[PDB]
Amino acid sequence: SLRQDILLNNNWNFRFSHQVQGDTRRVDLPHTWNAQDALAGKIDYKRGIGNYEKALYIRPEWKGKRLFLRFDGVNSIADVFINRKHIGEHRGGYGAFIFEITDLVKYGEKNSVLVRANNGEQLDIMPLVGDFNFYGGIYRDVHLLITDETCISPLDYASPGVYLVQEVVSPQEAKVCAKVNLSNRAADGTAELQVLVTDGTKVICKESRNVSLKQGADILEQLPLLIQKPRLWNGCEDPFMYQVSISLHKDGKQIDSVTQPLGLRYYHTDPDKGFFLNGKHLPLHGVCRHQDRAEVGNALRPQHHEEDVALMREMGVNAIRLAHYPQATYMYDLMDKHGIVTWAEIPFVGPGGYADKGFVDQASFRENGKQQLIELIRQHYNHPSICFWGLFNELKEVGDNPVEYVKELNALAKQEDPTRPTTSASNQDGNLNFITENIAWNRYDGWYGSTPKTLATFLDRTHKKHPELRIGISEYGAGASIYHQQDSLKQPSASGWWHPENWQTYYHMENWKIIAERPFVWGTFVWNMFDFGAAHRTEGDRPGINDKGLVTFDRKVRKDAFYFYKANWNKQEPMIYLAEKRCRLRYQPEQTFMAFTTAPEAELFVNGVSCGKQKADTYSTVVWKNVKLTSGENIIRVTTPGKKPLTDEVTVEYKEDRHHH
Amino acid sequence: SLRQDILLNNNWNFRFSHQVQGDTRRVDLPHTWNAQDALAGKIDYKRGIGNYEKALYIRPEWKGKRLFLRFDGVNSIADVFINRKHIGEHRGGYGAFIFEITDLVKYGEKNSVLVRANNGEQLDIMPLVGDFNFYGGIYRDVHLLITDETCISPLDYASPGVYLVQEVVSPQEAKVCAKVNLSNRAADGTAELQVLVTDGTKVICKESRNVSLKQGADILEQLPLLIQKPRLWNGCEDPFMYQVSISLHKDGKQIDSVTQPLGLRYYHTDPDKGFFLNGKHLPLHGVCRHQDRAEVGNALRPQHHEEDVALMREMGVNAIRLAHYPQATYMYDLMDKHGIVTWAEIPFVGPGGYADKGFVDQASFRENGKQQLIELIRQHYNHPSICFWGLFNELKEVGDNPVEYVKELNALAKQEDPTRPTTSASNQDGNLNFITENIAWNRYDGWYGSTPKTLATFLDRTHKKHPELRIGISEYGAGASIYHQQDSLKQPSASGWWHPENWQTYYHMENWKIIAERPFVWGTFVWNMFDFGAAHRTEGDRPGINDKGLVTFDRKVRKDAFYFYKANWNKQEPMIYLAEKRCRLRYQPEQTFMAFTTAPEAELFVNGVSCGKQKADTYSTVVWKNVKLTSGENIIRVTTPGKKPLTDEVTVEYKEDRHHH
Numbered sequence A, B: 001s002l003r004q005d006i007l008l009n010n011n012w013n014f015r016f017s018h019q020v021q022g023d024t025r026r027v028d029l030p031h032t033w034n035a036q037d038a039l040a041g042k043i044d045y046k047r048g049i050g051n052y053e054k055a056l057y058i059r060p061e062w063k064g065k066r067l068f069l070r071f072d073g074v075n076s077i078a079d080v081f082i083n084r085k086h087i088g089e090h091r092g093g094y095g096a097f098i099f100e101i102t103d104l105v106k107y108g109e110k111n112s113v114l115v116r117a118n119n120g121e122q123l124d125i126m127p128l129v130g131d132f133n134f135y136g137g138i139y140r141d142v143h144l145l146i147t148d149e150t151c152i153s154p155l156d157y158a159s160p161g162v163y164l165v166q167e168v169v170s171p172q173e174a175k176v177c178a179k180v181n182l183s184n185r186a187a188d189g190t191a192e193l194q195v196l197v198t199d200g201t202k203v204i205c206k207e208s209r210n211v212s213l214k215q216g217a218d219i220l221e222q223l224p225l226l227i228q229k230p231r232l233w234n235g236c237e238d239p240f241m242y243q244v245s246i247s248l249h250k251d252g253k254q255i256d257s258v259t260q261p262l263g264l265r266y267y268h269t270d271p272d273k274g275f276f277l278n279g280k281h282l283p284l285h286g287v288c289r290h291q292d293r294a295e296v297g298n299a300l301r302p303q304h305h306e307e308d309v310a311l312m313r314e315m316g317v318n319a320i321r322l323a324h325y326p327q328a329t330y331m332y333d334l335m336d337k338h339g340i341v342t343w344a345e346i347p348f349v350g351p352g353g354y355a356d357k358g359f360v361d362q363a364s365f366r367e368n369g370k371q372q373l374i375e376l377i378r379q380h381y382n383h384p385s386i387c388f389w390g391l392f393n394e395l396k397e398v399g400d401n402p403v404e405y406v407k408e409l410n411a412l413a414k415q416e417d418p419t420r421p422t423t424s425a426s427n428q429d430g431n432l433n434f435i436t437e438n439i440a441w442n443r444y445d446g447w448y449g450s451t452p453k454t455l456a457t458f459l460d461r462t463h464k465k466h467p468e469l470r471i472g473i474s475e476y477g478a479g480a481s482i483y484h485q486q487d488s489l490k491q492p493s494a495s496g497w498w499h500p501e502n503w504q505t506y507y508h509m510e511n512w513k514i515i516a517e518r519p520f521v522w523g524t525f526v527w528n529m530f531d532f533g534a535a536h537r538t539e540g541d542r543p544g545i546n547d548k549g550l551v552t553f554d555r556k557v558r559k560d561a562f563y564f565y566k567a568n569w570n571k572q573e574p575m576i577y578l579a580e581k582r583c584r585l586r587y588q589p590e591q592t593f594m595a596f597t598t599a600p601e602a603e604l605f606v607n608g609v610s611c612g613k614q615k616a617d618t619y620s621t622v623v624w625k626n627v628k629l630t631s632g633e634n635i636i637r638v639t640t641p642g643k644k645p646l647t648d649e650v651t652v653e654y655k656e657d658r659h660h661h
């Protein structure tokens, strides 16, 4: 009667329903059928039904236990059949879902499991539009869960069935209400519910209640926990969590158990001073991250989540906006573990500069959106990293006006979880900005026209006109191809096929200086940590890509901007990085070299001869001007001070040719 | 009158001719228009005409000079127009070509350069078939070359115009005939041709001749060079080259100059003992490499060539087969520089297990193939790394029988260059094997059916029946996806959608042991160093990919086999690598762990407790058997001996579940 969790990812048989013959090919999960077409820039990539079928041997000894199929994510509608009989449907591409199959299987034989996944367009399931790909299929894990007939229920919106509600938290004491779903299919009886909080081998809490469970009972039980002088989850400084074991016992035997983290903290956002974690001001040095990657689409493996977090911590990221939808439980686990303050959001996404709408005013759309919000909150309730619930991105009032509906979602979020503030990401003026507790804007001053300086004007004017708003920046960024390089700085056309890397570097340096000076801005999030898929894009070095990443789509190459942020945000790892190394061909008679470093100064050498030292500025940048190259090959080297220095080096070619002038 | 070489890669205007309207988009070279479609597995990817146009300002001061447009590579037919007037055509996707434009331009104004590139199917330009993509477009650099009216000619098959023919080479002395093409468009006159051999600042040779040049003269001049006690290019041990400057002088002024490397060596292949470089036996530890990469197709940048060579040297590669076509001058330069013995080949490729033919018996096909061979030899003549000329890959006699034609190519190769042997890569029995000086076979014993043991039987039986043959292995390999992992070793279906990484590891370990024991095998080349594009493939973890690489297509991930070879071929870099780390889920009650290391033994730890030391075998492999894991997470660590060890580590999950049995 130990709970079992059996992965069912291997060897499914797949075909599209547009293939009428019935032949199938082997696939293995996680899987999307849009990893080739959408990623090649095909705008009308396959959106429709793909069918996955697998034989599952139901063990004779599972008779008398309860059996559940839990899906971590299927985009975007899933219809599940056991022995070809429909058992249920889930509508929504990003939340987990579960079906009990206990009474639906034949014990001691192979049973068919068939999943018919549909990512076809709909007007009743958010997201309706967006600058990303709606990759179809079973792109997260599938599990067979086996439990006692009397269990901690897995059936409440596919959540772990335990909510560790933080009611009061300070360094003196924490009070928590452990709410636990119980489900009984055995005879009427009683059981003992135990909640055990530990830190390593040390017991911190232990609470018990006897509970009466009628046959067919599905009930919520609540146990208070008190922890004196708690160790708090304090972001990257100390991402500490207790372990909580919730178990059911009968006549001296444990019959079921689940574990969840408890990371205690408290926070607030001040309109003038920014974000405070556990009573201390904390600048939120944030980036955004989509759940896709080159070649595999959104069919991410655990090492992919692991590498994305490793790259963010290397850069000194301490905040993340996991846009534009609920992401993997494992990704939120890694945010908990590494101390990253997380903004998690539902996929209520508007059109941006494109056509159509994020909101369609019909009951089916509205009720589904509420179910997606409840899923997000209940499924991910216990992650201390999550400190904001995001309710939308770039909705607009024209046509169907989502204002009243967004007020409904806000009230529902506050009722489900009074312990986190709501937030949203806006690109509009007006009423949509005054609903959520924190507000943020997506700003591209210096990329989509204008100069970075208009970001400063916007922030200052907004803060002065509306002093009660807690203002953030939910997106800012600029495109870059690592293969587009030029000696001189000039602003490219955003929508064109030329995105020189130096303009992205310049964009981030100027925008960051504006942000750094404005502590009323509670958090800022770079769009985006990685290049990502968007099939309709036709810009930069190839179609189908949003190239605003600080790192490329395959996670292989860090663009110059990554190191500018690393020098400024990760000050305890010594480093020096020469900018513009991918610009190998130089034409300008007067060369400028620039390095990012954590050192107070650096020295430049050209062809083995020192050009002398320069001091790092407040933004960890060292600059040498009017450097003279010799025609042909030149070796450029920068070094930090001391007898054991760090170095960076490049060979460039200097050419006096051109073109008219 | 210094020679100028001006890169013309930036900002061309592109459209397909199937787009009849005339609108264009900016592109930048190197460029292929098949980097999205063919790489997504679209079998009928775009094969036809793409048009590139750029305005080129012709400087008034270039009047009186000579002007050439040189193309490093356009796949596969290029028609070039200046001010919309046709100037010439090149047929062949892999060799350089050049057109003089001196008398075709208007000086002091912008002139249009239009290139109409066509990669449409043809039956008169090899390669006609092949297991790779025929990526279309201007995928290598374009240059404007500016010279004196009297110059070292760039017009001999677009070669540098100098052939440093090695006539006798030993450690006592080297005799070289410097053959130099001269071209005069100025008045009848004389000039002084100088050939200067140097090592750093030291002069080793200096020879001069006066030459008489008629107006319109295009002539070949030959100067003998003698070098006493030469330093020889000796592979990776000492890849030494002299620098040669060839210059033309008049009345005390230098008027033109080119430089080429001189890497002196001699070699032979013995049917029983293998390959000898500079009189010393040298096992050729080889891999093959295609000129493509994820995302960019064959539009490779110099850092791509640089990274490919870096990865090969890391693995201890000392030989390379640059299949299946002439590759970049820069790639052969890197082979020279790093000491890698190189097999360079023309694209005379047969069908393998697929339909159609590599040979069509018509004069147009045959004459074009001879021009592609002459291009390869003349353009790449001076690279010491190149030690074999490959004439075909997998032709077959059935239908049009290429035997007589391959004898013609062999005789032409020997006439153009008596200093290198010819070779070929075969998958057939019979006469095709008895034409080139060295012969090699493509073998997949243990992958395309059978067991690796049949490679041993083939090699031994062939060597015994035909003792005069110099036998090599031109391809051997097996597919692997880094995302297909399983606890147990079982042979997969080659053509299926399941290519577990452990089978590739096993394949290479067994095949390498067969090779290592057989010194009569002069060279072996892994197919392939990298996964590569082949649009028609439908196997492994995604369509459109040949996944036989030791490294993935984006060059990011080294598969386990890479480290098996690194431990065995690069013995002077200490290392330890735990195999099967990507296999995170373990089911077998009895676990086996395996490490590759350069150390004589290694120690295993499980959950922090030593399982004891094991000795490395002759193949640098350490193995522990019957290792007991605890249910759930286990930390596995291996370390080399000593107080400062090298380590490798992984966390795996051990699960006692399954499926019937």
Ligand SMILES: [Cl-]
Pocket (backbone or CB within 6 Å): A350, A351, A357, A358, A359, A394, A395, A396, A397, A402
């Ligand atoms: Cl909207």
Ligand SMILES: [Cl-]
Pocket (backbone or CB within 6 Å): B350, B351, B357, B358, B359, B394, B395, B396, B397, B402
């Ligand atoms: Cl053939």
